[PDB]
Amino acid sequence: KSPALDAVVIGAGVTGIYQAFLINQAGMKVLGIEAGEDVGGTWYWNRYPGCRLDTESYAYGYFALKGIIPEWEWSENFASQPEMLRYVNRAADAMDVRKHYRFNTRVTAARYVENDRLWEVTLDNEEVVTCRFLISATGPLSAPDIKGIDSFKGESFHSSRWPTDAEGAPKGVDFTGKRVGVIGTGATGVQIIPIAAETAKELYVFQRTPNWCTPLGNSPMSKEKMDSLRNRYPTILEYVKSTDTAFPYHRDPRKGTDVSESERDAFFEELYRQPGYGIWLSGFRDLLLNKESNKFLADFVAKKIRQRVKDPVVAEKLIPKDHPFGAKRVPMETNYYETYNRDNVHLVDIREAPIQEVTPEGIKTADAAYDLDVIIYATGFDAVTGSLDRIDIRGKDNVRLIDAWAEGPSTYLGLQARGFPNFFTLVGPHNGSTFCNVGVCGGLQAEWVLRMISYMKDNGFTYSEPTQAAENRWTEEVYADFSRTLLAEANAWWVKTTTKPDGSVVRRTLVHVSGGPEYRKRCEQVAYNNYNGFELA
Numbered sequence: 001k002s003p004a005l006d007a008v009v010i011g012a013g014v015t016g017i018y019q020a021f022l023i024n025q026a027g028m029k030v031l032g033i034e035a036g037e038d039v040g041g042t043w044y045w046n047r048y049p050g051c052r053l054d055t056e057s058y059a060y061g062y063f064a065l066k067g068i069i070p071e072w073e074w075s076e077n078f079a080s081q082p083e084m085l086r087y088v089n090r091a092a093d094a095m096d097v098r099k100h101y102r103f104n105t106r107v108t109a110a111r112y113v114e115n116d117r118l119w120e121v122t123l124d125n126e127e128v129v130t131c132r133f134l135i136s137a138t139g140p141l142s143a144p145d146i147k148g149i150d151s152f153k154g155e156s157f158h159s160s161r162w163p164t165d166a167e168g169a170p171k172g173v174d175f176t177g178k179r180v181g182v183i184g185t186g187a188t189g190v191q192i193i194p195i196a197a198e199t200a201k202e203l204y205v206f207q208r209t210p211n212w213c214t215p216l217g218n219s220p221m222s223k224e225k226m227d228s229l230r231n232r233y234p235t236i237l238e239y240v241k242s243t244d245t246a247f248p249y250h251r252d253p254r255k256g257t258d259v260s261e262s263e264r265d266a267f268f269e270e271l272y273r274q275p276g277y278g279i280w281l282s283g284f285r286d287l288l289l290n291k292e293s294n295k296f297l298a299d300f301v302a303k304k305i306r307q308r309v310k311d312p313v314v315a316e317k318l319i320p321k322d323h324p325f326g327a328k329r330v331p332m333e334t335n336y337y338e339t340y341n342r343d344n345v346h347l348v349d350i351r352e353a354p355i356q357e358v359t360p361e362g363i364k365t366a367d368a369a370y371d372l373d374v375i376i377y378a379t380g381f382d383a384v385t386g387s388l389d390r391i392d393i394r395g396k397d398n399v400r401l402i403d404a405w406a407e408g409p410s411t412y413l414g415l416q417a418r419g420f421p422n423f424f425t426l427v428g429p430h431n432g433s434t435f436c437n438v439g440v441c442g443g444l445q446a447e448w449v450l451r452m453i454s455y456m457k458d459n460g461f462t463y464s465e466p467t468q469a470a471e472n473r474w475t476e477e478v479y480a481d482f483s484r485t486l487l488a489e490a491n492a493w494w495v496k497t498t499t500k501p502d503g504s505v506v507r508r509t510l511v512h513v514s515g516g517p518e519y520r521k522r523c524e525q526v527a528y529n530n531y532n533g534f535e536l537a
């Protein structure tokens with residue numbers, strides 16, 4: 001039996017729609033599947049107030065850099081979610097990609113059929129479609145275990161499904177007269193909190209531990225700036241393809257320990273005040289390698305927080321004590337810290353007073369009862385464990401992907417796993433999503449996968465799977481790269497350590513941290529050498 005499709009692509013975010021576009025442009029048959037009503041992924045799902053890029057719009061805008069929608073005009077240096085959604089909609093118009101997709105459809109299971117070298121893909125546990133290759137673009141992030149949520153009698157908002165009007169704007173964003181509680185001070189919370197505080201009668205921020213945040217420095221984009229950027233796109237593209245993260249930044253050549261205190265302070269002050277991520281990405285070369293260097297920057301950011309927040313007790317609570325700066329994807333913010341100088345804003349330390357439950361009346365901590373009218377659940381993400389866990393994926397000998405990866409992801413090139421032929425995982429933490437400009441990283445990744453599938457078609461190969469040796473060597477190489485950074489000591493659970501039935505010890509990181517260009521170079525050496533390390537038939 002032969003599959004009906006060359007490929008199924010799961011997800012209609014930026015990654016998935018471009019993979020689908022590429023496959024179709026190449027003359028192959030592709031079906032996209034998407035749970036939502038339309039395209040956008042992130043930019044479709046996340047509708048909460050303050051939702052905005054951390055990457056310069058022009059640098060994230062790969063579909064414009066690549067000449068798919070080159071006329072696109074950005075209105076701001078760091079585009080808001082509604083603009084991002086318009087960009088993805090326009091890109092999808094230009095790629096004519098919607099016709100290849102099933103919308104409002106969840107892939108519930110995928111099983112590899114060994115006799116027939118194809119995937120049976122189950123849609124909403126009913127229809128089954130067959131394809132030669134299965135490609136996940138289910139998103140680099142996934143996603144509250146609090147007693148009593150269902151009992152609250154006021155309004156509940158969840159940042160991941162913020163209610164919208166018929167025009168797609170967020171409902172109930174005016175909190176005039178309302179006592180509001182926000183739980184969470186990750187990326188979403190720090191975008192939500194300063195906006196909610198503008199109208200709430202009282203705002204309580206329930207925070208377990210603070211993250212490092214830096215100011216975004218967003219501003220409108222002039223027509224003149226937009227035109228000069230567009231004229232520079234061929235250069236901008238070459239640049240972002242050459243940096244380690246694919247953001248438009250590269251590390252300072254110097255070690256922080258080599259620079260005087262006075263020079264360090266001046267350098268940091270300039271970068272802190274420059275819009276975007278430079279404070280981190282343009283920082284000293286040893287910032288994520290060396291504790292002293294890291295501490296220089298963390299101390300500087302801490303000093304900036306103390307400047308910006310009036311009450312020294314409150315300030316201290318907002319400054320991380322227990323983790324290096326940049327050990328997580330750093331939230332950027334617009335007047336977040338100054339929000340706490342407002343008289344109607346209160347920080348509730350729930351490490352010291354954990355939440356016992358949500359009640360009909362509001363929130364109960366170990367120490368106090370907060371009567372609220374509104375609760376906003378500003379829930380975090382896992383940028384670490386990946387988005388495939390909700391799909392029943394079965395490879396050879398009916399093995400679960402979740403079991404195969406129990407001791408940590410095991411892949412070759414971060415793209416296929418032994419046991420799961422003709423299955424490609426785009427854009428996930430195990431291949432670099434966590435610290436990438438995903439607009440660019442993911443687009444380049446989809447192009448490599450296109451080239452592999454085309455090669456297979458040209459040669460009449462219908463089977464691909466990593467060897468055990470190549471998968472093992474890769475996975476050890478990725479771990480060793482990870483193990484030389486401060487991430488390893490700071491995020492201990494990002495590493496899975498397993499002593500084998502005999503005595504030897506296996507270590508795998510959940511998160512690939514290797515430089516983009518080095519990673520892509522290794523992928524091309526493999527592709528050039530007839531996909532050496534993949535068995536093909």
Ligand SMILES: Cc1cc2nc3c(=O)[nH]c(=O)nc-3n(C[C@H](O)[C@H](O)[C@H](O)COP(=O)(O)OP(=O)(O)OC[C@H]3O[C@@H](n4cnc5c(N)ncnc54)[C@H](O)[C@@H]3O)c2cc1C
Pocket residue numbers: 010011012013014015016017033034035036040041042043044046051052053054055060105106107108137138139140141187387391427436437438439442
């Ligand atoms: C608030 C926020 C701000 C961000 N800002 C930036 C930024 O500035 N720069 C940056 O590089 N990254 C940023 N990110 C990361 C973001 O994940 C990527 O930029 C990008 O949107 C990921 O695109 P994707 O297509 O790979 O996955 P997604 O955009 O997550 O799309 C995945 C799609 O797959 C669908 N799906 C999942 N499972 C199934 C299933 N089983 N069946 C059918 N459909 C399924 C989902 O519905 C979704 O539509 C941000 C993320 C968030 C949440």
